[PDB]
Amino acid sequence: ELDQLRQEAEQLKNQIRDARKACADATLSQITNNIDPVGRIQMRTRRTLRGHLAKIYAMHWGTDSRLLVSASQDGKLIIWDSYTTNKVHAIPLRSSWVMTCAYAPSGNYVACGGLDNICSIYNLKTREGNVRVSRELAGHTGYLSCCRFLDDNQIVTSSGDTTCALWDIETGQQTTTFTGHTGDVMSLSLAPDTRLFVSGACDASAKLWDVREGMCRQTFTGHESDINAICFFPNGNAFATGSDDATCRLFDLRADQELMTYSHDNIICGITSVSFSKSGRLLLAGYDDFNCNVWDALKADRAGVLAGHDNRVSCLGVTDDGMAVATGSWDSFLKIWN
């Protein structure tokens, strides 16, 4: 009786796609020609952060926009001061193989998951001068792809075992687990309201998840390859997915369909990280061509190119106020861009 249910689900999906295409008569690319397109945008390395000995895979920005955390494969998690280029905290990791970072909105908690799927959390504000381990989360069966801090108490994680679950630092167990994605999830993005979030799976599908309800709200399947990175629009109504087939797509939560795509024939390398500015009109993305490119969310044009990285760029983070952008590549170098 599985075949008839599969056919019914396929018919329902086809009807949903037809209903979405019926209301998709207008395109964003045909309306953006009226508004004045942004001119040429150039950015230079404000400060070159030195002190890493391995590839930098992920980074996060704090609410104060002054401290950033970055992980290297050597096993050292360094917290950098963006203004003075100073290492305020450098902590050793039990597992040198680390693939993600996280910075709590309060600014006292930092978490970094890796291949050992142990989402070790650290308390920065302690009685002693040195930072110590707070908790270890080993419930996941796959490598932690990305971890994000919902608040000081709760933390949501994304692991290589095609399931994602939010954790409690005090408890240490998964209260809610999302297992709707069949493909491997690679990145995680939190909304400013923290009420909902989206993740990008390897099945060319990024779905909406609820932190409170714990169910799959809406699933967006508009890509042709695996989704390597994902970011959320500051407005809260849309979000962008950075896949590995050199294209980016901005999906709308209310429209439940791909509003428009960012496709350029010159670039053929996939996207490792996707970020957004304060307003959201300018979204940034890092490609495998050893440099990250600046894209326009409305006009869909390459506004600028940020070169100067010796190796491939992996992480890309923008501050909350949008003052500067930190770009991290595999050359063990962190660069701050205006």
Partner 1 sequence: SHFFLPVSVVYVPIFVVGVIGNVLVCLVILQHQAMKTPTNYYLFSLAVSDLLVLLLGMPLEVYEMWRNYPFLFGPVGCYFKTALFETVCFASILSITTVSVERYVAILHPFRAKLQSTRRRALRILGIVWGFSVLFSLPNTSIHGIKFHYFPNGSLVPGSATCTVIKPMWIYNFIIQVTSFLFYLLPMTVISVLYYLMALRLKKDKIQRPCRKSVNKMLFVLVLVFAICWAPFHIDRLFFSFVEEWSESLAAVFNLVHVVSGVFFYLSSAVNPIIYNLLSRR
Partner 2 sequence: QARKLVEQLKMEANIDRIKVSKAAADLMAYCEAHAKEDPLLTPVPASENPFRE
Partner 3 sequence: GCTLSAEDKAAVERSKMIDRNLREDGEKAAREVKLLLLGAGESGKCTIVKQMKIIHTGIVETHFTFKDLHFKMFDVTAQRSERKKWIHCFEGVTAIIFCVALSDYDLVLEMNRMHASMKLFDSICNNKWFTDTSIILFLNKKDLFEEKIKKSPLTICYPEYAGSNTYEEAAAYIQCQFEDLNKRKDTKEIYTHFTCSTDTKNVQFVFDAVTDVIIKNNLKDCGLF
With beta carbons less than 8 A apart as the criterion, state whether 274 and 242 touch. yes
- How far is it, in rounded angstroms, from Cα 208 to Cα 197? 6
With beta carbons less than 8 A apart as the criterion, state whether 230 and 185 touch. no
Assigned token pair, 117: 């799927």
Determine what percent of the chain falls in helix, strand and coil, rounding each to the nearest 5. Answer: 5, 45, 50
Quote the least distance from Cβ 237 to partner 3, whole Å. Answer: 30
Quote the least distance from Cβ 310 to partner 1, whole Å. Answer: 4
* Residue range at the interface with partner 3 (CB under 8 A); choices 11-19, 112-120, 249-257, 302-310: 112-120
331 binds, among partner 2, partner 3, partner 1, none (CB under 5 to 8 A by kind): partner 1
Quote the least distance from Cβ 317 to partner 1, whole Å. Answer: 23
Applying CB under 8 A, among 184, 226, 244, 256 the residue interacting with partner 2 is 256
81 binds, among partner 3, partner 2, partner 1, none (CB under 5 to 8 A by kind): partner 3
CA torsion through residues 149, 153, 159, 164, sign: negative
| DSSP state string for 63-74 | TTSSEEEEEETT
With beta carbons less than 8 A apart as the criterion, state whether 153 and 168 touch. yes
Q: Which of residues 62-91 bind partner 3 (CB under 8 A)?
A: 73-76, 78, 81, 84, 86-88, 90
Instruction: Give residue for tokens 């040429």.
Output: 40
Quote the least distance from Cβ 99 to partner 1, whole Å. Answer: 22
Residues near partner 2, by CB under 8 A: 2, 5-6, 8-9, 12-13, 16, 19-20, 23-28, 31-32, 35, 38, 41, 46-47, 82-83, 180, 215-219, 233-235, 237-238, 252, 254-257, 259, 277-282, 297-298, 318, 321-325, 336, 338
